[PDB]
Design a binder for this molecule. Structure first.
Ligand SMILES: Cc1cc2c(cc1F)OC[C@@H](NS(=O)(=O)c1cc(C(=O)N3CC(C)(C#N)C3)c(C)[nH]1)C2
Length: 129
């Protein structure tokens, strides 16, 4: 199905998975299976400086969830995170819109912005201002 994104997570550079991992640590802090559920996610969404609803919190979860159980694993995270910044996840219809870089800024900081994606160095990089 989403082989593009599914495989994309693997195409990423060492710096990508490395930085992304540093965030997942805190993102899935306390989770049952180190995943990102409505609770683990809702805690981050608000940490950025917002306050979403519980009904919507589940939406985004399953929206990216591969199993559709209500959680997001490592790969599943990169699958949506890889397109997050690209703005090619699903669309920008409703006002709601979560950014990848923004989130990282909370988990870690600016480290996951300029010195995040190493692909820009030599590897190909599309939709990357
Ligand atoms: C499990 C997981 C999934 C998603 C995550 C991060 C994750 F941890 O981030 C991206 C998200 N895709 S999305 O369409 O941007 C998106 C954002 C939101 C949302 O609840 N809000 C935007 C907000 C912060 C405001 N204002 C409230 C919704 C419902 N979809 C899907």
């Amino acid at each position: 199905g989403d082989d593009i994104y599914k495989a994309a997570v693997e195409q990423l550079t060492e710096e990508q998975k490395n930085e992304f991992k540093a965030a997942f640590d805190i993102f899935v802090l306390g989770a049952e299976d180190g995943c990102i559920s409505t609770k683990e996610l809702g805690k981050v969404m608000r940490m950025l400086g917002q306050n979403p609803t519980p009904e919507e919190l589940q939406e985004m979860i399953d929206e990216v969830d591969e199993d559709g159980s209500g959680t997001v694993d490592f790969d599943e995270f990169l699958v949506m995170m890889v397109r997050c910044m690209k703005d090619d996840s699903k669309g920008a219809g409703a006002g709601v819109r979560i950014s990848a870089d923004a989130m990282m800024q909370a988990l870690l900081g600016a480290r996951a912005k300029e010195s995040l994606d190493l692909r820009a160095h030599l590897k190909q990089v599309k939709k990357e201002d």
